Write an enzyme that holds these catalytic residues in place. Structure first.
Site, PDB file in Angstrom:
ATOM      1  CE1 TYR A  47       0.939   1.617   4.469  1.00  0.00           C
ATOM      2  CE2 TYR A  47       0.686  -1.073   4.403  1.00  0.00           C
ATOM      3  CZ  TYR A  47       1.586   0.338   4.594  1.00  0.00           C
ATOM      4  OH  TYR A  47       1.821   0.248   6.187  1.00  0.00           O
ATOM      5  CB  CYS A  48       1.998   4.069  -1.424  1.00  0.00           C
ATOM      6  SG  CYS A  48       1.026   3.897  -2.879  1.00  0.00           S
ATOM      7  CG  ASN A  49      -1.219   9.765  -0.150  1.00  0.00           C
ATOM      8  OD1 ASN A  49      -0.418  10.761  -0.683  1.00  0.00           O
ATOM      9  ND2 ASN A  49      -2.370   9.857   0.052  1.00  0.00           N
TER      10      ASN A  49
END
Length: 85
Positions: A47-49
């Site tokens: 995941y990430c921004n």
């Protein structure tokens, strides 16, 4: 087994990330995913921004021959608790 790997840029990981994860930014992932996840058959949750660095990490990781990479979501959308750097 599985691992949660935040792949946003390192300065953004430190703002706030899902608890109990590691950070291997998209920029660095190539040099290091092999050390964090030495067995490809292991489930890699990325995941990430905003999902991008995860979708991108997913491409190069499939090419490196990881067969179990999954974009869990983005920081916000993920219902799990978070902690700060």
């Amino acid at each position: 087994a599985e691992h949660w790997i935040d792949v946003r840029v390192p300065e953004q990981y430190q703002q706030e990330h899902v608890q109990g994860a590691i950070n291997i930014p998209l920029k660095e992932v190539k040099e290091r995913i092999a050390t964090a996840v030495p067995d490809k058959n292991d489930t890699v949750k990325v995941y990430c921004n905003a999902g991008r660095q995860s979708g991108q990490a997913k491409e190069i990781l499939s090419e490196m021959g990881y067969t179990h990479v999954e974009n869990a979501g983005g920081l916000k959308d993920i219902a799990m608790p978070k902690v700060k750097g």
